[PDB]
Design a protein around this ligand. Sequence first.
Ligand SMILES: Cc1c(CP(=O)(O)O)c2ccc(N3CCCC3)cc2n(CC2CCCC2)c1=O
Ligand SMILES: [Zn+2]
Ligand SMILES: [Zn+2]
Length: 229
Amino acid sequence: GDQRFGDLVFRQLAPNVWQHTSYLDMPGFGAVASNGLIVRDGGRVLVVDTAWTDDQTAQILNWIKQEINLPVALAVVTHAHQDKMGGMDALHAAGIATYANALSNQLAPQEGMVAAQHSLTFAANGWVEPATAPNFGPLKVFYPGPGHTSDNITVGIDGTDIAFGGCLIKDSKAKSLGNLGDADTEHYAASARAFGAAFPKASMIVMSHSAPDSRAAITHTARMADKLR
Ligand SMILES: Cc1c(CP(=O)(O)O)c2ccc(N3CCCC3)cc2n(CC2CCCC2)c1=O
Ligand SMILES: [Zn+2]
Ligand SMILES: [Zn+2]
């Protein structure tokens, strides 16, 4: 059930959850799909990840306006790369409170990203320090450890079977682990499984560059990561 809205695709995953998809024509490799989430929490909307660009991100807000018609209370972005943080200005222009890993906001300038307004910090166990993620409601935010990037974070939705690995997790039939230029070879496998252990009740794993999968994605990604050991 893919709904086309301008150059973006929206798919309902569950009663209060949609997957937003945006495309960037990358030279030689084609038009790359990137996924985030839109979660209705009672009388407000929560956004996970921007589109690639400000224009695309503004089309997510246009879609929310038409299809939900409630204020976007906050957005959380899963690491400091264009597919996840490219549209930060569009969120700020819309007056939306924005949250990222402290380290994402630290990296954002040199990555050519605009920093989120607010910084998340994580306890030893990797769960977000609740003080830093206020009014997140059903969004459960977890730092699995260094993987796809050193600053990558994951999000589960309470009252839902859905967990989001971002660019850390690839689908169960994936060939490679993709871009590893900013990756941590050592702890990737561990981080991939820490995400799995953090959301064990999650039967639908949403990820950046594939349609939603089974938990096989996590094991498959972790198993492919174990070759980097
Ligand atoms: C940041 C980044 C991404 C997004 P992410 O998956 O790393 O989050 C990317 C995402 C996808 C991608 N092709 C998709 C199929 C296989 C590879 C390449 C990506 N390249 C490398 C390009 C930079 C300019 C020319 C090559 C990236 O630099
Ligand atoms: Zn990335
Ligand atoms: Zn990615």
